[model samples]
Target: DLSGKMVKQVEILSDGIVFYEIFRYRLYLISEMSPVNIQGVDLLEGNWGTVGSVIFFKYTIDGKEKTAKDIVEAIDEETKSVTFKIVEGDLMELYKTFIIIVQVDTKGEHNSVTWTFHYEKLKEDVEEPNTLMNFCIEITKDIETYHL
Candidate 1:
């Protein structure tokens, strides 16, 4: 198969632009918000938010720590979306290719957060990334709650 794809979304009351910036310019702020879920974020190549820049992520899911090295694949301010392609770290062990997109939007009057996963499994035994998707959903709500 080409790859596997999954999406998870949550209703958010915060401003979409403001929310998107957390994944864009203010990624470091995540650690303060979710001390355990997000351990840290660092810029490894180029300036933050620049396409092609590489970033490092240390996070915990299901009580196990993991890391991912990602290149900033795409950033569309107009659509409030940021895309990341994981090139290294734990997830690379099971997936031949992995890409994650974080997007925020409004449904008429209300707002929501959408997380997309695009990946290709290395083997048929590889498990789907439900834990990581749960992590994203957890952050979405915490970020929204942080604003309130």
Candidate 2:
């Protein structure tokens, strides 16, 4: 276990949106495109393939515009899961280089969103990306609400 925080868990009312659908669309969008419009954030092609194919995205981090390409390492659509490795771009320098896997537990009322940020900080001064996490949660809500 790392001395720093591994994950943070916070639950907000999903409204009338069922948790399974919320999780599915979240994995769908994040692995592809975000339906919510933000100024610079864009996902190119929105390819839903796995292992070797690239996922492209342009976004702002800490107010600076940046872009990155992440290679799909694994995907399990039924479980709404994906794993990725950074293959290109400036944003790769933002944190430790590692793989990320996002999965949804939709068995029964066991609905939950899991994010594995896979990295060891290059420097201890860096912290988790709260902005990105908040952005993701907001989109999760959007996708769930849209499906309803």
Candidate 3:
């Protein structure tokens, strides 16, 4: 299989546990928190922070607006990670499969947000999803700044 993976980590001065709680349960608030990047987030199926639920996202990256629908695949309390499987979106055009896992690791006085992307490209001609990762980082930093 022609698969690709990307991981990014950023250390924050804010409380990561508080941030993770919001990421895990109150995701709808994210659109409000990162209004610059995340325009809106709507519940589509099931409930937020639960397995099998689906969510719709309206976001912008590099000045271009994009849309994505992802299913909550897993929520691991032990590792403090959330897995999102991309079921439908503009991202599907470039990738056959896309899955994103966000994990928070607390070390030192601060904490780190770890983003892992597991995917398969539609073709070699398609470029890697670097901007998408940046988008995630941008939100992370924004949220980090908000709590600081």
Candidate 4:
């Protein structure tokens, strides 16, 4: 398996804990609240805001529709971070494993959000998930705007 990673960092204008709490409880709202970028999110198993849960998501990337199933693997309130592991969907076709880590930092009055993508490609022909990072950035911005 070939592996790659992508990271996106953005300065946020909100409390890091607020962002973290909202993300933990309201991630399902991404489909309904995000801009045209995130089409929808469905809770496939377990509760909406619990660990070891699964979510199916639909979105458009570069004018093409894509879908993915991700499992909530970890959440840390103290660090304001969450990790999602992709177990199925279009991403699995090109990557043997895909994981997304979202972490937020708050210092003084400055806050920032970072999105990290780690993946092992199924083959060398597979492309890196740069577009998916863009999608995560856009979704983060949308969530920030919604709270503000």
Candidate 5:
């Protein structure tokens, strides 16, 4: 098995508290507000905004449609962070497991958003999810713009 981690950051030109609020309320916003790179997110089970909830995502990769399901692993309101564990999806076909973590830090005039990807590939030939990371960055930009 091949494993790796990737991190990406974005600067939000808004109040840090606002970013946290958005992060905490992402489930509600995510489904209703489609990110520029995302097609849609469907709640599969459990409470939409709570941990252990399952969600199915429909998005495009290189213009090819792809689908995947992820479970909310954990959330921390004080730290302004959330984590999702991928349980099933097209990604599972290529990766044994994948976990995505998003955290926000609020500064007075500028805020920082960080995304971490931890994943293991099924085989050596599998490629890293650079595009997927890029997708997250694009979504961050969209969310920031939505709030601004």
Candidate 6:
């Protein structure tokens, strides 16, 4: 049997994370159905800021829906990166408790977007999701062209 694929294999440079996931889709605007409203639009959430910050969101796991809270471990605006740990959630069942880091880097001339996916697969034969990579690339093009 082939070895199981690790979900956290994705790692890119520009964005600083393994997955080039934008904090807010379409520039400071979360997806239409984004469950939680980010605290201060690129800033920490709520009156409680900095590490140990908690945010509420409804996330789905294995077709089962549940609400959970995650704590912010760190944020670097200079690098446009954020590290968060899932404190309480069903998602933890399939994933070992670990921190996820994401960042974005775009230069004046060279435009390159990167994404990092920090995760470990629960089993083998589970290949990385390439569709997400395509999605990121498509979105990157859209944003770059639109100047948004």
Per residue, candidate 3 scores C-alpha lDDT tens digits across 1-148 of 5788999998877788877887888888888789999998988999988989999999888778989999999999877899999988899989999999999986547789999999999998888889899989988888888854
Predict model 1's lDDT versus the native: 0.87
Model 6 misplacement above 4 A: 1-28, 31-49, 60-66, 110-113, 120-148
lDDT on C-alpha atoms for all candidate structures = 0.87, 0.54, 0.88, 0.83, 0.79, 0.45
Per-residue lDDT tens digits for candidate 6, residues 56-89, read 6553333455644667777676666666666666
List of clashing residue pairs for candidate 3: none
Model 4, 22: alpha-carbon shift in Å? Answer: 3.0
Candidate 5 lDDT over 1-148, as tens digits, reads 4999999888876566766665555555754444545778778888766888888888877778888888889998777888999988789998998999998876566679999999999999999999889888877777666754
Sort all candidates by lDDT, best to worst: 3, 1, 4, 5, 2, 6
- Candidate 5 error regions (>4 Å): 31-36
The residue-by-residue lDDT of candidate 4 on 17-127, one tens digit each, is 667766777786777668487778888898866889898888888888888999999988777888999998888888999999998886737889989898999999888
Score every model by TM-score.
0.94, 0.63, 0.94, 0.90, 0.87, 0.50
Cα deviation of 63, candidate 1, in Å: 1.2
> Between 3 and 6, whose TM-score is larger?
3
Better model by TM-score: candidate 4 vs candidate 5: 4
Model 1 segments more than 4 A misplaced:
106-108
Clashing residue pairs in candidate 5, if any?
Answer: none
Q: Which consecutive 10 residues in model 4 have the weakest lDDT in total?
A: 13-22
Which of candidates 3 and 4 is the stronger one according to lDDT? 3
